[PDB]
Ligand binder design. Sequence first.
Ligand SMILES: O=C(Nc1ccccc1C(=O)O)c1cccc(S(=O)(=O)N2CCc3ccccc3C2)c1
Ligand SMILES: O=C(Nc1ccccc1C(=O)O)c1cccc(S(=O)(=O)N2CCc3ccccc3C2)c1
Lengths: 257, 255
Amino acid sequence: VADLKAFSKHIYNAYLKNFNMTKKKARSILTAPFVIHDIETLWQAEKGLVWGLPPYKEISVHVFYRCQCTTVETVRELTEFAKSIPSFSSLFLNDQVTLLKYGVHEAIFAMLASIVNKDGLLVANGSGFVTREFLRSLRKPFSDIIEPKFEFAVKFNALELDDSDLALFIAAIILCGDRPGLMNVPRVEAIQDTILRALEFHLQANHPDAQYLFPKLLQKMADLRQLVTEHAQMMQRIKKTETETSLHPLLQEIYKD
Amino acid sequence: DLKAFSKHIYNAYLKNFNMTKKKARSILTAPFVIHDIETLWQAEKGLVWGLPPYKEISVHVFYRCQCTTVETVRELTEFAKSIPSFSSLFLNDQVTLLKYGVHEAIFAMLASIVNKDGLLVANGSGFVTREFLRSLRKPFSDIIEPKFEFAVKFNALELDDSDLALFIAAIILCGDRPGLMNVPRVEAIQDTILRALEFHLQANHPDAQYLFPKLLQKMADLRQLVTEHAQMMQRIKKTETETSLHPLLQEIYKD
Ligand SMILES: O=C(Nc1ccccc1C(=O)O)c1cccc(S(=O)(=O)N2CCc3ccccc3C2)c1
Ligand SMILES: O=C(Nc1ccccc1C(=O)O)c1cccc(S(=O)(=O)N2CCc3ccccc3C2)c1
């Protein structure tokens, strides 16, 4: 219980040091950003009011490129976050990459819930708010990509986790010993079990009255697996049917499996 | 900007490697001499030094080479990370560079702990004789011999630690590695290292002609060396099935 109070605080610092957008910062904004709800307001957002990119093609593809850019920026933040966990950094560099490779999207979808409400999501570091309605209005198969992440984000936010809960949840997602090609599995498993025990102790103190919060959270991790799988499946469809669209090499690398 | 860069790398080098060429040369000019089974046994029992379960002598030496190789991969990983431009690459690119670079780097650094007669082991405490390494049974005797051949020809160039620092950095930040994600960037960093190395060789070795191009040729030689090493490790994995290879080395010899 004592080594676990310490551990949790250490991770919460790695979290606060490395992510530009916390749930605390986001909730206070969501309760002014510039609302992007159509082409005119998107054009206005670009021209200064909110914001290099691959050459212009069309609006649904443009949004698709901005999602990729945001995804990459978050992979960096997550990379720096993980490295800030001493036990992570003491793994072999090839194992670090394996964990990140299979972990990042699950983590990204987990953190998305922080910047989301029923109506849309905060973009460009809180400067803008893209409406969910506008994202459904994009042509197929681009409209299909973001919609399930929303569905998930609403159900997730109902658990009312704060940044210190998320810190440990994210760390658990990344330091997960079931990843294929993992070199030193027992070690990764050991570190995970510590994170999970820490998370669980932390949930008791931080949420005294919330029942079943820990097992519900574990189920959320299973859900994120299904989410990422379904994401990968859709990116295959874009790579095949939308050959004119281009995918950032780092995402190509991740989606490869 | 190149005087600065070189000094920065020389610090990463001195901070990260336990055995420099200066430290080695002064020892090689007392370590405990391992030249046979009795002196190997004596070296183990305290006089010099977990491992995989005992099998036989040629395999034991083979396990100690693996252990040393792994420890150096760590030192090299920390060394490279100590280059800001390296650390600013994507983590998957860092791993690619290290994957294909380390063995070339290891064989380059080996020359520092080697003379005609043998090599310094266990952080300078011991000296294993070349003769004893030839005396090991096949295919284990074949593994180390070419690295020696290379190390003698290499030491003739009389490089100091500050030359090696930049040479190693060049070996690692090499943009010709397969599966490299951001090639132009890696190439840009390399060219800086190579320009630095070249400027540094003029100042550090005013009279040595053709030292820079000869060094470039040494990098091509190391490629051939590593290729031939990989080929031999395939033979041990296939014919010596009872022998075990460290998982990290299994990863590197794969592709
Ligand atoms: O909707 C989003 N962003 C935007 C939407 C509209 C306009 C601008 C942006 C932006 O973030 O710049 C948005 C943000 C964060 C996350 C997401 S997502 O739906 O979780 N995302 C992550 C993985 C991924 C990988 C490849 C392609 C698309 C995606 C989609 C969307
Ligand atoms: O000769 C050496 N080591 C020893 C030999 C005898 C006894 C002890 C040691 C020791 O290093 O402790 C030795 C040291 C450092 C390097 C080398 S090596 O020949 O460059 N080495 C590196 C790659 C590799 C990978 C897998 C298997 C073998 C090898 C061969 C040998």
